[PDB]
PDB file of all heavy atoms in Angstrom:
ATOM      1  N   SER A   1       0.799  -1.189   0.000  1.00 51.51           N
ATOM      2  CA  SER A   1       0.000   0.000   0.000  1.00 51.51           C
ATOM      3  C   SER A   1       0.853   1.269   0.000  1.00 51.51           C
ATOM      4  O   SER A   1       0.585   2.235  -0.719  1.00 51.51           O
ATOM      5  CB  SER A   1      -0.978  -0.072   1.198  1.00 51.51           C
ATOM      6  OG  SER A   1      -1.741   1.068   1.165  1.00 51.51           O
ATOM      7  N   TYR A   2       1.912   1.293   0.822  1.00 51.68           N
ATOM      8  CA  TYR A   2       2.810   2.438   0.789  1.00 51.68           C
ATOM      9  C   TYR A   2       3.435   2.594  -0.606  1.00 51.68           C
ATOM     10  O   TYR A   2       3.625   3.680  -1.045  1.00 51.68           O
ATOM     11  CB  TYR A   2       3.984   2.316   1.796  1.00 51.68           C
ATOM     12  CG  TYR A   2       3.574   2.198   3.257  1.00 51.68           C
ATOM     13  CD1 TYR A   2       4.257   1.354   4.098  1.00 51.68           C
ATOM     14  CD2 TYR A   2       2.561   2.972   3.787  1.00 51.68           C
ATOM     15  CE1 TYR A   2       3.929   1.256   5.441  1.00 51.68           C
ATOM     16  CE2 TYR A   2       2.188   2.846   5.129  1.00 51.68           C
ATOM     17  CZ  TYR A   2       2.915   2.041   5.963  1.00 51.68           C
ATOM     18  OH  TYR A   2       2.536   1.885   7.298  1.00 51.68           O
ATOM     19  N   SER A   3       3.830   1.493  -1.221  1.00 50.95           N
ATOM     20  CA  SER A   3       4.505   1.580  -2.515  1.00 50.95           C
ATOM     21  C   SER A   3       3.589   2.159  -3.564  1.00 50.95           C
ATOM     22  O   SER A   3       3.999   2.989  -4.369  1.00 50.95           O
ATOM     23  CB  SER A   3       4.970   0.219  -2.925  1.00 50.95           C
ATOM     24  OG  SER A   3       5.965  -0.228  -2.049  1.00 50.95           O
ATOM     25  N   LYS A   4       2.321   1.780  -3.528  1.00 47.56           N
ATOM     26  CA  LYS A   4       1.372   2.379  -4.447  1.00 47.56           C
ATOM     27  C   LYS A   4       1.214   3.862  -4.198  1.00 47.56           C
ATOM     28  O   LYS A   4       1.184   4.673  -5.110  1.00 47.56           O
ATOM     29  CB  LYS A   4       0.010   1.667  -4.353  1.00 47.56           C
ATOM     30  CG  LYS A   4      -1.004   2.259  -5.302  1.00 47.56           C
ATOM     31  CD  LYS A   4      -2.188   1.309  -5.418  1.00 47.56           C
ATOM     32  N   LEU A   5       1.113   4.216  -2.949  1.00 48.23           N
ATOM     33  CA  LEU A   5       0.976   5.591  -2.580  1.00 48.23           C
ATOM     34  C   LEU A   5       2.148   6.429  -3.037  1.00 48.23           C
ATOM     35  O   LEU A   5       1.990   7.422  -3.630  1.00 48.23           O
ATOM     36  CB  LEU A   5       0.867   5.714  -1.069  1.00 48.23           C
ATOM     37  CG  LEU A   5       0.828   7.125  -0.470  1.00 48.23           C
ATOM     38  CD1 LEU A   5      -0.382   7.930  -0.896  1.00 48.23           C
ATOM     39  CD2 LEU A   5       0.904   7.079   1.033  1.00 48.23           C
ATOM     40  N   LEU A   6       3.328   5.973  -2.698  1.00 44.53           N
ATOM     41  CA  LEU A   6       4.590   6.687  -2.930  1.00 44.53           C
ATOM     42  C   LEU A   6       5.015   6.756  -4.365  1.00 44.53           C
ATOM     43  O   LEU A   6       5.378   7.752  -4.838  1.00 44.53           O
ATOM     44  CB  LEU A   6       5.683   6.221  -1.995  1.00 44.53           C
ATOM     45  CG  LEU A   6       5.334   6.347  -0.526  1.00 44.53           C
ATOM     46  CD1 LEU A   6       6.205   5.528   0.378  1.00 44.53           C
ATOM     47  CD2 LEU A   6       5.301   7.788  -0.102  1.00 44.53           C
ATOM     48  N   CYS A   7       4.987   5.640  -5.033  1.00 43.96           N
ATOM     49  CA  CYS A   7       5.214   5.688  -6.476  1.00 43.96           C
ATOM     50  C   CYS A   7       4.209   6.613  -7.157  1.00 43.96           C
ATOM     51  O   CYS A   7       4.531   7.313  -8.105  1.00 43.96           O
ATOM     52  CB  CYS A   7       5.080   4.256  -7.049  1.00 43.96           C
ATOM     53  SG  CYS A   7       6.444   3.169  -6.585  1.00 43.96           S
ATOM     54  N   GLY A   8       2.958   6.609  -6.686  1.00 48.38           N
ATOM     55  CA  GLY A   8       1.910   7.503  -7.284  1.00 48.38           C
ATOM     56  C   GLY A   8       2.274   8.952  -7.110  1.00 48.38           C
ATOM     57  O   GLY A   8       2.209   9.744  -8.056  1.00 48.38           O
ATOM     58  N   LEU A   9       2.714   9.323  -5.899  1.00 46.33           N
ATOM     59  CA  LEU A   9       3.203  10.670  -5.708  1.00 46.33           C
ATOM     60  C   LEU A   9       4.422  11.028  -6.509  1.00 46.33           C
ATOM     61  O   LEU A   9       4.555  12.133  -7.059  1.00 46.33           O
ATOM     62  CB  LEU A   9       3.476  10.913  -4.231  1.00 46.33           C
ATOM     63  CG  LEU A   9       2.216  11.045  -3.399  1.00 46.33           C
ATOM     64  CD1 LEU A   9       2.464  10.775  -1.920  1.00 46.33           C
ATOM     65  CD2 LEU A   9       1.563  12.413  -3.568  1.00 46.33           C
ATOM     66  N   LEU A  10       5.403  10.129  -6.567  1.00 44.52           N
ATOM     67  CA  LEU A  10       6.617  10.424  -7.345  1.00 44.52           C
ATOM     68  C   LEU A  10       6.292  10.512  -8.871  1.00 44.52           C
ATOM     69  O   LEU A  10       6.914  11.299  -9.601  1.00 44.52           O
ATOM     70  CB  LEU A  10       7.688   9.320  -7.137  1.00 44.52           C
ATOM     71  CG  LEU A  10       8.209   9.241  -5.663  1.00 44.52           C
ATOM     72  CD1 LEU A  10       9.072   8.009  -5.475  1.00 44.52           C
ATOM     73  CD2 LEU A  10       8.951  10.489  -5.359  1.00 44.52           C
ATOM     74  N   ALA A  11       5.353   9.669  -9.343  1.00 43.39           N
ATOM     75  CA  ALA A  11       4.915   9.788 -10.737  1.00 43.39           C
ATOM     76  C   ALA A  11       4.228  11.106 -11.032  1.00 43.39           C
ATOM     77  O   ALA A  11       4.570  11.786 -12.005  1.00 43.39           O
ATOM     78  CB  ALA A  11       4.025   8.603 -11.112  1.00 43.39           C
ATOM     79  N   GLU A  12       3.257  11.430 -10.221  1.00 42.89           N
ATOM     80  CA  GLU A  12       2.469  12.611 -10.401  1.00 42.89           C
ATOM     81  C   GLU A  12       3.217  13.882 -10.190  1.00 42.89           C
ATOM     82  O   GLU A  12       3.091  14.751 -10.969  1.00 42.89           O
ATOM     83  CB  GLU A  12       1.256  12.564  -9.489  1.00 42.89           C
ATOM     84  CG  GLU A  12       0.273  13.688  -9.709  1.00 42.89           C
ATOM     85  N   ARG A  13       4.016  13.969  -9.141  1.00 42.70           N
ATOM     86  CA  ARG A  13       4.663  15.213  -8.826  1.00 42.70           C
ATOM     87  C   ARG A  13       6.012  15.387  -9.433  1.00 42.70           C
ATOM     88  O   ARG A  13       6.429  16.500  -9.715  1.00 42.70           O
ATOM     89  CB  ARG A  13       4.736  15.401  -7.289  1.00 42.70           C
ATOM     90  CG  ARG A  13       3.453  15.280  -6.534  1.00 42.70           C
ATOM     91  CD  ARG A  13       2.395  16.270  -7.045  1.00 42.70           C
ATOM     92  NE  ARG A  13       1.207  16.216  -6.208  1.00 42.70           N
ATOM     93  CZ  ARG A  13      -0.009  16.619  -6.581  1.00 42.70           C
ATOM     94  NH1 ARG A  13      -0.238  17.087  -7.799  1.00 42.70           N
ATOM     95  NH2 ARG A  13      -1.025  16.519  -5.734  1.00 42.70           N
ATOM     96  N   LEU A  14       6.779  14.314  -9.576  1.00 41.87           N
ATOM     97  CA  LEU A  14       8.139  14.411 -10.108  1.00 41.87           C
ATOM     98  C   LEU A  14       8.307  13.764 -11.457  1.00 41.87           C
ATOM     99  O   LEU A  14       9.400  13.804 -11.996  1.00 41.87           O
ATOM    100  CB  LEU A  14       9.146  13.725  -9.129  1.00 41.87           C
ATOM    101  CG  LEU A  14       9.246  14.282  -7.700  1.00 41.87           C
ATOM    102  CD1 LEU A  14      10.407  13.711  -6.886  1.00 41.87           C
ATOM    103  CD2 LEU A  14       9.310  15.776  -7.662  1.00 41.87           C
ATOM    104  N   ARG A  15       7.259  13.180 -12.006  1.00 42.89           N
ATOM    105  CA  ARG A  15       7.280  12.542 -13.311  1.00 42.89           C
ATOM    106  C   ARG A  15       8.268  11.373 -13.407  1.00 42.89           C
ATOM    107  O   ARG A  15       8.880  11.175 -14.382  1.00 42.89           O
ATOM    108  CB  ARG A  15       7.543  13.531 -14.456  1.00 42.89           C
ATOM    109  CG  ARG A  15       6.810  14.860 -14.446  1.00 42.89           C
ATOM    110  CD  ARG A  15       5.335  14.750 -14.170  1.00 42.89           C
ATOM    111  NE  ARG A  15       4.627  13.755 -14.961  1.00 42.89           N
ATOM    112  N   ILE A  16       8.380  10.615 -12.354  1.00 42.35           N
ATOM    113  CA  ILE A  16       9.269   9.490 -12.346  1.00 42.35           C
ATOM    114  C   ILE A  16       8.384   8.266 -12.543  1.00 42.35           C
ATOM    115  O   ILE A  16       7.398   8.029 -11.789  1.00 42.35           O
ATOM    116  CB  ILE A  16       9.999   9.338 -10.984  1.00 42.35           C
ATOM    117  CG1 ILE A  16      10.812  10.589 -10.709  1.00 42.35           C
ATOM    118  CG2 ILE A  16      10.823   8.052 -10.977  1.00 42.35           C
ATOM    119  CD1 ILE A  16      11.372  10.666  -9.323  1.00 42.35           C
ATOM    120  N   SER A  17       8.757   7.456 -13.525  1.00 41.21           N
ATOM    121  CA  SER A  17       8.040   6.180 -13.719  1.00 41.21           C
ATOM    122  C   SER A  17       8.173   5.254 -12.503  1.00 41.21           C
ATOM    123  O   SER A  17       9.274   5.062 -12.000  1.00 41.21           O
ATOM    124  CB  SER A  17       8.544   5.501 -15.001  1.00 41.21           C
ATOM    125  OG  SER A  17       7.864   4.288 -15.174  1.00 41.21           O
ATOM    126  N   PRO A  18       7.074   4.625 -12.083  1.00 41.37           N
ATOM    127  CA  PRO A  18       7.091   3.733 -10.935  1.00 41.37           C
ATOM    128  C   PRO A  18       8.058   2.571 -11.079  1.00 41.37           C
ATOM    129  O   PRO A  18       8.522   2.031 -10.066  1.00 41.37           O
ATOM    130  CB  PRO A  18       5.664   3.259 -10.863  1.00 41.37           C
ATOM    131  CG  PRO A  18       4.850   4.372 -11.380  1.00 41.37           C
ATOM    132  CD  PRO A  18       5.706   5.058 -12.415  1.00 41.37           C
ATOM    133  N   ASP A  19       8.346   2.157 -12.296  1.00 38.62           N
ATOM    134  CA  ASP A  19       9.263   1.059 -12.488  1.00 38.62           C
ATOM    135  C   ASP A  19      10.742   1.495 -12.407  1.00 38.62           C
ATOM    136  O   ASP A  19      11.633   0.743 -12.582  1.00 38.62           O
ATOM    137  CB  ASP A  19       8.972   0.272 -13.747  1.00 38.62           C
ATOM    138  CG  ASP A  19       9.279   1.026 -15.005  1.00 38.62           C
ATOM    139  OD1 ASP A  19       9.267   2.262 -15.034  1.00 38.62           O
ATOM    140  OD2 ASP A  19       9.557   0.334 -15.964  1.00 38.62           O
ATOM    141  N   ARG A  20      10.955   2.761 -12.156  1.00 40.87           N
ATOM    142  CA  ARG A  20      12.254   3.324 -11.973  1.00 40.87           C
ATOM    143  C   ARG A  20      12.393   3.875 -10.536  1.00 40.87           C
ATOM    144  O   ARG A  20      13.098   4.803 -10.275  1.00 40.87           O
ATOM    145  CB  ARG A  20      12.596   4.315 -13.065  1.00 40.87           C
ATOM    146  CG  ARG A  20      12.763   3.690 -14.429  1.00 40.87           C
ATOM    147  CD  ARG A  20      13.069   4.775 -15.456  1.00 40.87           C
ATOM    148  NE  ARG A  20      14.370   5.391 -15.282  1.00 40.87           N
ATOM    149  CZ  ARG A  20      15.514   4.749 -15.422  1.00 40.87           C
ATOM    150  NH1 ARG A  20      15.503   3.489 -15.740  1.00 40.87           N
ATOM    151  NH2 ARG A  20      16.654   5.341 -15.237  1.00 40.87           N
ATOM    152  N   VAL A  21      11.683   3.227  -9.627  1.00 39.86           N
ATOM    153  CA  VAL A  21      11.716   3.537  -8.244  1.00 39.86           C
ATOM    154  C   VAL A  21      11.933   2.322  -7.350  1.00 39.86           C
ATOM    155  O   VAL A  21      11.264   1.339  -7.488  1.00 39.86           O
ATOM    156  CB  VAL A  21      10.388   4.236  -7.798  1.00 39.86           C
ATOM    157  CG1 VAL A  21      10.304   4.419  -6.292  1.00 39.86           C
ATOM    158  CG2 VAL A  21      10.155   5.531  -8.535  1.00 39.86           C
ATOM    159  N   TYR A  22      12.808   2.470  -6.386  1.00 41.52           N
ATOM    160  CA  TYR A  22      13.004   1.479  -5.355  1.00 41.52           C
ATOM    161  C   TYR A  22      12.711   2.151  -4.006  1.00 41.52           C
ATOM    162  O   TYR A  22      13.182   3.242  -3.749  1.00 41.52           O
ATOM    163  CB  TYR A  22      14.419   0.920  -5.279  1.00 41.52           C
ATOM    164  CG  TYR A  22      14.773  -0.162  -6.288  1.00 41.52           C
ATOM    165  CD1 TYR A  22      16.017  -0.214  -6.863  1.00 41.52           C
ATOM    166  CD2 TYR A  22      13.867  -1.121  -6.659  1.00 41.52           C
ATOM    167  CE1 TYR A  22      16.347  -1.178  -7.779  1.00 41.52           C
ATOM    168  CE2 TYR A  22      14.180  -2.087  -7.568  1.00 41.52           C
ATOM    169  CZ  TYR A  22      15.421  -2.117  -8.140  1.00 41.52           C
ATOM    170  OH  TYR A  22      15.701  -3.073  -9.029  1.00 41.52           O
ATOM    171  N   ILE A  23      11.966   1.465  -3.170  1.00 42.80           N
ATOM    172  CA  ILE A  23      11.695   1.953  -1.804  1.00 42.80           C
ATOM    173  C   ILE A  23      12.106   0.889  -0.815  1.00 42.80           C
ATOM    174  O   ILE A  23      11.534  -0.226  -0.847  1.00 42.80           O
ATOM    175  CB  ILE A  23      10.233   2.307  -1.567  1.00 42.80           C
ATOM    176  CG1 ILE A  23       9.744   3.355  -2.556  1.00 42.80           C
ATOM    177  CG2 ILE A  23      10.042   2.836  -0.131  1.00 42.80           C
ATOM    178  CD1 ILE A  23       8.251   3.331  -2.724  1.00 42.80           C
ATOM    179  N   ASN A  24      13.106   1.166   0.039  1.00 43.49           N
ATOM    180  CA  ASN A  24      13.474   0.211   1.063  1.00 43.49           C
ATOM    181  C   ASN A  24      12.679   0.559   2.326  1.00 43.49           C
ATOM    182  O   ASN A  24      12.708   1.719   2.800  1.00 43.49           O
ATOM    183  CB  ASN A  24      14.974   0.226   1.334  1.00 43.49           C
ATOM    184  CG  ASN A  24      15.798  -0.406   0.207  1.00 43.49           C
ATOM    185  OD1 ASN A  24      16.894   0.053  -0.160  1.00 43.49           O
ATOM    186  ND2 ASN A  24      15.302  -1.504  -0.284  1.00 43.49           N
ATOM    187  N   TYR A  25      12.057  -0.458   2.874  1.00 47.95           N
ATOM    188  CA  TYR A  25      11.239  -0.346   4.084  1.00 47.95           C
ATOM    189  C   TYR A  25      12.031  -0.912   5.241  1.00 47.95           C
ATOM    190  O   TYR A  25      12.557  -2.005   5.158  1.00 47.95           O
ATOM    191  CB  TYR A  25       9.905  -1.088   3.995  1.00 47.95           C
ATOM    192  CG  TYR A  25       9.043  -0.492   2.938  1.00 47.95           C
ATOM    193  CD1 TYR A  25       8.996  -1.015   1.647  1.00 47.95           C
ATOM    194  CD2 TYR A  25       8.319   0.641   3.186  1.00 47.95           C
ATOM    195  CE1 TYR A  25       8.206  -0.414   0.672  1.00 47.95           C
ATOM    196  CE2 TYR A  25       7.524   1.223   2.238  1.00 47.95           C
ATOM    197  CZ  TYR A  25       7.498   0.712   0.937  1.00 47.95           C
ATOM    198  OH  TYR A  25       6.708   1.374  -0.038  1.00 47.95           O
ATOM    199  N   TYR A  26      12.040  -0.141   6.351  1.00 47.74           N
ATOM    200  CA  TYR A  26      12.766  -0.537   7.593  1.00 47.74           C
ATOM    201  C   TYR A  26      11.820  -0.479   8.815  1.00 47.74           C
ATOM    202  O   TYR A  26      11.329   0.573   9.137  1.00 47.74           O
ATOM    203  CB  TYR A  26      13.933   0.366   7.850  1.00 47.74           C
ATOM    204  CG  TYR A  26      14.922   0.361   6.748  1.00 47.74           C
ATOM    205  CD1 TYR A  26      14.857   1.305   5.753  1.00 47.74           C
ATOM    206  CD2 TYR A  26      15.922  -0.640   6.695  1.00 47.74           C
ATOM    207  CE1 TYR A  26      15.767   1.308   4.722  1.00 47.74           C
ATOM    208  CE2 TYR A  26      16.827  -0.675   5.640  1.00 47.74           C
ATOM    209  CZ  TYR A  26      16.741   0.313   4.653  1.00 47.74           C
ATOM    210  OH  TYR A  26      17.619   0.335   3.615  1.00 47.74           O
ATOM    211  N   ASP A  27      11.592  -1.646   9.395  1.00 51.58           N
ATOM    212  CA  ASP A  27      10.820  -1.811  10.657  1.00 51.58           C
ATOM    213  C   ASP A  27      11.797  -1.651  11.798  1.00 51.58           C
ATOM    214  O   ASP A  27      12.526  -2.568  12.155  1.00 51.58           O
ATOM    215  CB  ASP A  27      10.180  -3.175  10.729  1.00 51.58           C
ATOM    216  CG  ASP A  27       9.254  -3.315  11.935  1.00 51.58           C
ATOM    217  OD1 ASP A  27       9.108  -2.371  12.743  1.00 51.58           O
ATOM    218  OD2 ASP A  27       8.623  -4.364  11.982  1.00 51.58           O
ATOM    219  N   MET A  28      11.875  -0.427  12.299  1.00 53.71           N
ATOM    220  CA  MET A  28      12.872  -0.086  13.340  1.00 53.71           C
ATOM    221  C   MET A  28      12.392  -0.555  14.738  1.00 53.71           C
ATOM    222  O   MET A  28      11.244  -0.331  15.137  1.00 53.71           O
ATOM    223  CB  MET A  28      13.133   1.406  13.382  1.00 53.71           C
ATOM    224  CG  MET A  28      13.625   2.042  12.111  1.00 53.71           C
ATOM    225  SD  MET A  28      15.177   1.346  11.562  1.00 53.71           S
ATOM    226  CE  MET A  28      16.304   1.890  12.836  1.00 53.71           C
ATOM    227  N   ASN A  29      13.324  -1.066  15.501  1.00 51.30           N
ATOM    228  CA  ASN A  29      13.083  -1.393  16.893  1.00 51.30           C
ATOM    229  C   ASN A  29      13.102  -0.062  17.654  1.00 51.30           C
ATOM    230  O   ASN A  29      13.944   0.718  17.400  1.00 51.30           O
ATOM    231  CB  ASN A  29      14.147  -2.330  17.421  1.00 51.30           C
ATOM    232  CG  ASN A  29      13.872  -2.764  18.833  1.00 51.30           C
ATOM    233  OD1 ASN A  29      13.921  -1.973  19.745  1.00 51.30           O
ATOM    234  ND2 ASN A  29      13.493  -4.001  18.991  1.00 51.30           N
ATOM    235  N   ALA A  30      12.151   0.172  18.548  1.00 49.97           N
ATOM    236  CA  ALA A  30      12.073   1.422  19.279  1.00 49.97           C
ATOM    237  C   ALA A  30      13.389   1.761  20.015  1.00 49.97           C
ATOM    238  O   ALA A  30      13.727   2.936  20.147  1.00 49.97           O
ATOM    239  CB  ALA A  30      10.898   1.358  20.303  1.00 49.97           C
TER     240      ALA A  30
END
């Protein structure tokens, strides 16, 4: 869900194709 959201923003606002995006997700310990 985040990836859809974020790629959508980067596509719409920065004109970056979603297939040219990598998002690393980190579940941090408090």
Side-chain angles (χ1 to χ4, degrees), residues 1-3 5-11 13-14 16-30:
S1 181
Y2 300 141
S3 294
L5 175 63
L6 303 163
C7 289
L9 288 159
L10 296 171
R13 307 303 185 201
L14 300 190
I16 300 170
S17 180
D19 70 334
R20 293 179 68 65
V21 172
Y22 280 142
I23 303 157
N24 288 141
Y25 296 96
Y26 300 94
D27 187 359
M28 302 300 293
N29 184 293

